[PDB]
């Protein structure tokens, strides 16, 4: 570790030079300023994630009420006297019902 | 007789594909949300911590 | 050679990132809970302050 | 044992030379920094293993 000892020493001496360059007040103000820029960027990242909560809520609302419009029409199909058309409507509704469930799981 | 049976076979195989490609679009929409969340979480861990020089 | 094989290869990477992100927090240590309990406690003091007026 | 003696002598003289370059105060601080940079790498190695548990 003879080389490794020297390599460590060079690094320590370099660190001491940076430590000398650091003025107490001016580095200290700048340090707070860096945190302020970083925090705002992060808050925007979090905001863009909290967006997907709202989007998942939106996606769910849609499909649930589209499922109803299939139900409405299916029952009206019974009145007109076609069970085949009614099953075709109801099956599709079932798939929307399944999709909405998946959203709640996620949400 | 063969054509009418064949059409039904083709129609159902296609319907299964159409459904599964639909599953994939649904996968993708929610899957990106996690990627955004995971990345964002990592930045919070870094800012709270960080060690050495 | 396949579109599907590439797609579900990608999902695994996202899941690995999600899992890794939580694990980093687990090892970091959480102190949030103790801090939150102080906020809840603060609220209980404020209940009495409301009651007096 | 001739080669063996000579090789150990050469190392010893080099050890004195690099120990002159070790200033004890600054080298001590740098080692504490080294440990801390390493510690981050290790924590994130563990995190990627705990990830596979989940």
Curated annotation (Swiss-Prot), chain B:
<comment type="function">
    <text>Required for thylakoid formation.</text>
</comment>
<protein>
    <recommendedName>
        <fullName>Membrane-associated protein Vipp1</fullName>
    </recommendedName>
</protein>
<comment type="similarity">
    <text>Belongs to the PspA/Vipp/IM30 family.</text>
</comment>
Curated annotation (Swiss-Prot), chain D:
<comment type="similarity">
    <text>Belongs to the PspA/Vipp/IM30 family.</text>
</comment>
<protein>
    <recommendedName>
        <fullName>Membrane-associated protein Vipp1</fullName>
    </recommendedName>
</protein>
<comment type="function">
    <text>Required for thylakoid formation.</text>
</comment>
């Amino acid at each position: 570790a003879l080389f490794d000892r020297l390599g460590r020493v060079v690094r320590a001496n370099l660190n001491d030079l940076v430590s000398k360059a650091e003025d107490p007040e001016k580095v200290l103000e700048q340090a707070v300023i860096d945190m302020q820029e970083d925090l705002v960027q992060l808050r925007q990242a979090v905001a863009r994630t909290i967006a997907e909560e709202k989007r998942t809520e939106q996606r769910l609302n849609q499909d649930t009420q589209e499922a109803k419009k299939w139900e409405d029409r299916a029952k009206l199909a019974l009145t007109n006297g076609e069970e085949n058309l009614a099953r075709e409507a109801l099956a599709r509704k079932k798939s929307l019902t399944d999709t909405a469930a998946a959203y709640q799981t996620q949400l | 007789a063969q054509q009418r049976t064949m059409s039904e076979n083709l129609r159902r195989n296609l319907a299964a594909l159409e459904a599964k490609i639909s599953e994939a679009k649904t996968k993708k929409n929610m899957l990106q949300a996690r990627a955004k969340a995971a990345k964002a979480n990592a930045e919070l861990q870094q800012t709270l911590g960080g060690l050495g020089t | 050679s396949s579109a599907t094989s590439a797609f579900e290869r990608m999902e695994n990477k996202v899941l690995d990132m999600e899992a890794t992100s939580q694990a980093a927090g687990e090892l970091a240590g959480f102190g949030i809970e103790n801090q939150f309990a102080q906020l809840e406690a603060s609220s209980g003091v404020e209940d009495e302050l409301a009651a007096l007026k």
